[PDB]
Design a protein around this nucleic acid. Structure first.
Ligand SMILES: Nc1ncnc2c1ncn2[C@H]1C[C@H](O)[C@@H](COP(=O)(O)OP(=O)(O)C(Cl)(Cl)P(=O)(O)O)O1
Ligand SMILES: [Mg+2]
Ligand code: NA
Ligand code: NA
Ligand code: NA
Length: 327
DNA sequence: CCGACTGCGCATCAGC
DNA sequence: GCTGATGCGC
DNA sequence: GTCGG
């Protein structure tokens, strides 16, 4: 695991993953490419043959021969064809706009709309999310210094307590994994009257306060238990203005905080691997519970697990501190 | 051969 | 008006 | 695409 050790191969595989997910709409081939890329990135030798990478789990016949052509030529003809393709590469660029998924991108590129500027000229064709994602295209691709994360944590934690002092609020994602910067802010919220009982306005009246102090600036999706939006650091003096940042708030049964904070921590590829091999041991994890798989695919009742892990040694795994879960 | 593949809330689409 | 499906991004 | 029934 030393980045440049096989970065060429994993670059190519990540670039293929993206083409599959954005252009072919083959979310399974995408996941397969992402899994081959990940395992190879952890592998502690430099691959010199597709047959050597083939021994790894998740590398198969087709990827092995893509490794050989890459090794032998420096290039992948499929990739270089794909990158040169004005329709494929437009669709790929469009999906970088929050809210423009792969189906939207195709529909836009089909009707001639290929650039951000094409998009601005056609805002009637855009739902609410897409205009916001287009409004803030550059900002949403910037990183958030951990120091700005902490200032965002102050505002969130301050304004949350102002509403109701038995709210707990927990900033998860890469932040809680110690990351020196983050892509967005992930806030986990629990309140004692949300368990198996309930009154469901707990999220709304927290969003509203954060809007009232002008921290939250836009709304991408808002529900009973999940808010997705935009939020900005207040600025001072004649300062440059901070960028607009993506924030999600997720409100979990307090009874199920542990599964919630594990999922939201996560990382995302780490969750995919932990759940996948929770399956191998006949358990299923989600943000809520951990359940056994009975004779075949059961659930019925889960245990209200009491510890910050146990989730973790139920699946015969040695505890990975959040620093060690960006994997 | 063939199907499973990590898991899910909200917005919007499809349809009655 | 409703229910149920799909796209989308966690 | 890969893996396993
Ligand atoms: N497909 C998924 N499956 C399971 N869990 C997921 C998935 N996607 C997201 N999560 C969980 C896990 C994920 O950790 C959490 C927050 O999602 P972010 O997209 O913000 O992930 P991140 O780690 O914060 C990041 Cl490295 Cl992208 P940053 O934006 O900080 O740079 O939601
Ligand atoms: Mg994050
Ligand atoms: Na193998
Ligand atoms: Na997008
Ligand atoms: Na997020």
């Amino acid at each position: 695991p030393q980045e440049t050790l096989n970065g060429g191969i994993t670059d190519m595989l990540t670039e293929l993953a993206n083409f599959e997910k954005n252009v072919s709409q083959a979310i399974h081939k995408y996941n397969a490419y992402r899994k081959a890329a990940s395992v190879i990135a952890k592998y502690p030798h430099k691959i010199k043959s597709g047959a050597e990478a083939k021994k790894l789990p998740g590398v198969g016949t087709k990827i092995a021969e893509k490794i050989d052509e890459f090794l032998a030529t420096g290039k992948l003809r499929k990739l270089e064809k794909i990158r040169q393709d004005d329709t494929s590469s437009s669709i790929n660029f469009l999906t970088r706009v929050s809210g423009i998924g792969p189906s939207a991108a195709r529909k836009f590129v089909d009707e001639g709309i290929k650039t951000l500027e094409d998009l601005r000229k056609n805002e009637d064709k855009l739902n609410h999310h897409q205009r916001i994602g287009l409004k803030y295209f550059g900002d949403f691709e910037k990183r958030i210094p951990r120091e700005e994360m902490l200032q965002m944590q102050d505002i969130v934690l301050n304004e949350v307590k102002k509403v109701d002092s038995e709210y707990i609020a927990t900033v998860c994602g890469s932040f809680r994994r110690g990351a020196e910067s983050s892509g967005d802010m992930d806030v986990l919220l629990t309140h004692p009257s949300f368990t198996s009982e309930s009154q469901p306005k707990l999220l709304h009246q927290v969003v509203e306060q954060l809007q009232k102090v002008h921290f939250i600036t836009d709304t991408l999706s808002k529900g009973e238990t999940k808010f997705m939006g935009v939020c900005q650091l207040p600025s001072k003096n004649d300062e440059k203005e901070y960028p607009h940042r993506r924030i999600d708030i997720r409100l979990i049964p307090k009874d199920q905080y542990y599964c919630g904070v594990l999922y939201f921590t996560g990382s995302d590829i780490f969750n995919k691997n932990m759940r996948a091999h929770a399956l191998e041991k006949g358990f299923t994890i989600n943000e809520y519970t951990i359940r056994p798989l009975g004779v075949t695919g059961v659930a019925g009742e889960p245990l209200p697990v009491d510890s910050e892990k146990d989730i973790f040694d139920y699946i015969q795994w040695k505890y990975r501190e959040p620093k060690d879960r960006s994997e």
